[PDB]
Amino acid sequence: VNLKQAILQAWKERWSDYQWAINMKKFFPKGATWDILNLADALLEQAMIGPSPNPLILSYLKYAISSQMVSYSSVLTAISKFDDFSRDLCVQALLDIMDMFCDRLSCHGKAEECIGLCRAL
Amino acid sequence: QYLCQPLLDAVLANIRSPVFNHSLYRTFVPAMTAIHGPPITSIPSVLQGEVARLDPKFLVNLDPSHCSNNGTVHLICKLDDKDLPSVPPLELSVPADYPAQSPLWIDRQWQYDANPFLQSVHRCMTSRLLQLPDKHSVTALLNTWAQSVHQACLSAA
Secondary structure, three states, rough: OOHHHHHHHHHHOOHHHHHHHHHHHHHHOOOOHOOOOHHHHHHHHHOOOOOOHHHHHHHHHHHHHHHOOOHHHHHHHHHHHHHHOOHHHHHHHHHHHHHHHOOOOOOOOOOOHHHHHHHHH | OOOOOHHHHHHOOOOOOOOOOHHHHHHHHHHHHHHOOOOOOHHHHHHHHHHHHHOOOOOOEEEOHHHHHOOOEEEEEOOOOOOOOOOOOOOOEEEOOOOOOOOOEEEOOOOOOOHHHHHHHHHHHHHHHOOOOOOOOOOHHHHHHHHHHHHHHHHOO
């Protein structure tokens, strides 16, 4: 259920967004709510490799954002950690992704998760 | 009727009198006493039950926000099906006196937008909820949600 190992197999054959989501669950029996795994962070690492970020990783990130069970804080921290301003394509893609899910910032869960969201913000 | 008209006439001509009971007792106690002798020596239960009796695909629970312990309750739903992808929570509101009426679904249009798959789910959802009859329950709506997700997934692939 390793992140790189599963992402490579997903990438080799063109898969729809829902099929990859269905498949990921099948790959690892204990999901652990995507916390130890840092799935949002892992996608970014694949995305920044190419000079132009591939649209399929961005679509996977969009789908992960769509589900309420993926916290917005982890995505924000992963985006902030990268920086390094190599080229305009990556910053434009990150700008579009950030523009997509902002202005709501709704968090459901325990209070310490809200505290972590404040620090991530 | 037959053989007992005099008793009916006597009773009707005697009724609503302040001393009717005294008259009846004084006229009918002694023979009866002599012949026979002495006389004889929050959350309503319906919602809890229906939640207890749902398929383990669902783990519905109370909404952390909104009011509670009233006739109207709010529930948030999550779907855990190995064969289906993840979808918006599809929260519900249950009014007071849930039997003999129907619950309503709070639409969230922006949540289901920006994806062809999710808006296909949404239009199938609107179609199915227009196809649902009156006086329906919440388990029927949850099963409709599951079946609409399955149909949308089948149509996509």
